[PDB]
């Protein structure tokens, strides 16, 4: 596929104006991969530039770049909406949406927001509900389990905490 | 204020994709 080797070019010249503090070449490159995955129209684009969008949010989170992080919150929900306009297969929204609300939960949990890393699980819990799947609870637990890991990593005992709460709550 | 921005923003982001996907199903 010609359309993956697109978004890993501007993936590169993303995460690396995410270090220098370049924030108006991560606008650029971000918004790009956005016309990328809109173009296209396939499930594997949009979902794609959410890697992207995860990337550059790591990368700016590691270098102090507050604000690209923020842009990079921004692109994650215009992909998701974008999705909901684009496809038609009401799964592969399900599977677009946790995987965007797990990529601002893994971003929340190095903040240590705890209490957008509540929401985070609060809101993956209930998109798990209206669709009923045993694919949107497979997602759901992944979203405790990336919360749980990497808030062990940073040593932000708040969210270890809610995220084995939550944890235990669906396993009922 | 800057991380208060950032934790503002997480939540809307969050709320406005659950509202989404609320009114497709």
Same mark, same amino acid.
């Given at each position: 596929?010609?359309?993956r ?9 993303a995460?690396?104006? @995410?270090?220098e503090?370049?924030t108006?070449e991560?606008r ?5 991969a ?20 995860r990337?550059?949010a ?10 690209a992080?923020?842009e ?6 215009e992909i998701?909406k974008?999705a909901?306009?684009?496809?038609k297969?009401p799964? @592969?929204?399900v599977?677009?949406?946790?995987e965007?609300?797990?990529?601002v939960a893994?971003?929340?949990?190095? @903040?240590?927001?705890?209490?957008a890393?509540?929401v985070a ?15 949107a609870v497979?997602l759901a ?12 990593? @940073?040593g932000?005992?708040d ?5 084995e709460?939550?944890?235990k709550?669906?396993?009922?």
């Amino acid at each position: 596929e010609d359309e993956r080797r697109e978004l890993e070019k501007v993936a590169r010249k993303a995460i690396e104006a @995410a270090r220098e503090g370049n924030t108006d070449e991560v606008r650029e490159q971000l918004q790009r991969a956005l016309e990328i995955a809109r173009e296209s129209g396939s499930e594997e684009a949009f979902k794609l530039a959410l890697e992207v969008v995860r990337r550059v949010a790591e990368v700016a989170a590691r270098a102090g770049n507050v604000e690209a992080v923020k842009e990079a919150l921004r692109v994650a929900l215009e992909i998701v909406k974008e999705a909901m306009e684009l496809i038609k297969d009401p799964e @592969a929204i399900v599977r677009l949406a946790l995987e965007a609300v797990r990529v601002v939960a893994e971003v929340a949990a190095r @903040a240590g927001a705890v209490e957008a890393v509540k929401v985070a699980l609060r809101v993956a819990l209930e998109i798990a509900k209206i669709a009923g799947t045993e694919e949107a609870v497979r997602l759901a637990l992944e979203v405790v389990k990336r919360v749980s890991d990497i808030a062990k990593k @940073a040593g932000n005992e708040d969210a270890v905490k809610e995220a084995e709460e939550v944890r235990k709550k669906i396993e009922e």
